[PDB]
Nucleic acid binder design. Sequence first.
RNA 1: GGGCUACACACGUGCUACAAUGGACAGAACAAAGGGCAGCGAAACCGCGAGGUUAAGCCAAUCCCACAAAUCUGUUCUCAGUUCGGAUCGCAGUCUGCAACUCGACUGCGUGAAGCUGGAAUCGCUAGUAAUCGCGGAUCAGCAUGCCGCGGUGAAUACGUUCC
RNA 2: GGGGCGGUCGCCUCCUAAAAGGUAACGGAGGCGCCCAAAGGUUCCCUCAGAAUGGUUGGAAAUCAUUCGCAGAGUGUAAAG
Lengths: 178, 84, 119
Amino acid sequence: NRLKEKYNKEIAPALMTKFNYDSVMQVPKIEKIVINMGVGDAVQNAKAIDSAVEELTFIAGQKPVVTRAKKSIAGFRLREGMPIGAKVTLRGERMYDFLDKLISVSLPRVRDFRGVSKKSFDGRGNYTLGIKEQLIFPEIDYDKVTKVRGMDIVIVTTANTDEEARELLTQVGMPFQK
Amino acid sequence: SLKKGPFVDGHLMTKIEKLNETDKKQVVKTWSRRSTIFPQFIGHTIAVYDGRKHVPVFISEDMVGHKLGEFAPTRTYKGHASDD
Amino acid sequence: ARIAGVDIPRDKRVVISLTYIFGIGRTTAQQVLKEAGVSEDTRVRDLTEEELGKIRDIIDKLKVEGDLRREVSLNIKRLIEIGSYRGIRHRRGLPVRGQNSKNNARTRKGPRRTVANKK
RNA sequence: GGGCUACACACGUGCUACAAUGGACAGAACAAAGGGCAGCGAAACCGCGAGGUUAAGCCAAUCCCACAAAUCUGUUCUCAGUUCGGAUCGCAGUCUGCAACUCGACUGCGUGAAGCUGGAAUCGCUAGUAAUCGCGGAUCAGCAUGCCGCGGUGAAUACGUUCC
RNA sequence: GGGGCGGUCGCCUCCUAAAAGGUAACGGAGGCGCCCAAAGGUUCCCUCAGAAUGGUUGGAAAUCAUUCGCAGAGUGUAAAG
């Protein structure tokens, strides 16, 4: 909750002076994060896609749900049924308890990483990010999982423009390659 | 190399020195590829004598300790018959 | 997992156990243990609750796994954009150090196959 | 200045391994022969190492190259792509040379291919031979897994001329 | 539109059929001797296809976020409604 108090006292007042706001009260707000698994099956016979689903319980406490395909693909499995990947939509106090782990711990842990996200902005608001290691998340043990599985994060901004959406992220302490 | 130090033939030294102090002449041939690139030599473009034909070479800040003639390969690729 | 070099194994003596770390080798392990005074110790993994931490700091001074991979990667990327000739050897499948090609040197070339005959 | 060192590949011929009769560490111990003054270069000192600084002696049964290695004695790993093997490459040094990019050697550090004994087929050798471990020299500014030698350790089998 | 040969014989959709319906030809285009205990019944909820942008192993596409989408979707199977 320390991150949650942080924008209630530090970020917002500074954000208010950076440019004018209609009706004073208006301020961009984080909405939902969506974590993707993908897995890739390779090919369909994981055999246990659910074993990957258990792994995501560590990255976030919200229960993952498998994303069943709504369309068949000629190049890869499969027609509808036998779900591929998983999805999570953490909210509330969980939102900043998770984001606090992201800046302070997750991103710096990565080897080659120093900073990203420049062209990444939609020009509308939403942020996107890729995650390629479970070593990135401290709660996971090294002994578990063995083979690497992919991950994603998508922060949402209330702001109607990326210029406002970006400035909100900078005060959060989010890294940028610059 | 070893110590004291990298060794240009020394004619390239006075050439690039005069070209640096004034004139700013560009594109010059050299037969002596053995000479190493120097910080004073930066930004010049030299036609490198591989033997068959001179190959011009711009000098980025990144290249210094690499030999000047190293950048141009005398070798012709490949040559092979049925590719793919 | 793990406290220093990520994913060090188990049921092995500590020296070979952190030689596995992408960074420290054998003699470097001999040096960090010479600083340690462990004496080997311990065949399995049971060191000490705080000594594991002080060793974790000395290993932390050394650097560093996937970022060390980024060192070699950024280095060869420096070796290709520079012109070049060395990175040219890195991607021809040509050996870089300079040891012919008329025979062997299959470390990059791979096994199969063949596409010639006469007559 | 290049090239004789090409590179998708084939073949001939060597080297190193695929490991517990072993690997790694520590201690201990036994050679022969050859080379050396535009040379060998001890010892002392500096550097983890390579080498460097400095310099005694030696035209050599005097001195130097020079320490023999396998082995033995213990410690340790306990059967695996491994403390097996070292490839490839990166970085940082070093010897020689006006000069080490093409296209030299060596070292320190890091990276840790393939290979867990190999199809068809094929080679050597009747005893100090095969097996294997180190050393020296010719070559030579530098460069010897090749060649020529030196010694250490040191077997199995030979019924026989049916067959090649 | 002589017979023989070929093809066809029943049911269902559209057009030809001419703004009720019907309506012929060996006229023009297609389907069916099924399928489903659920894709049925009821109740409570939800809205598509495709596009653009951003993104790990994701490439023209498996997955996910967003503006756009009066339906360019889906409606077991084929057409009209």
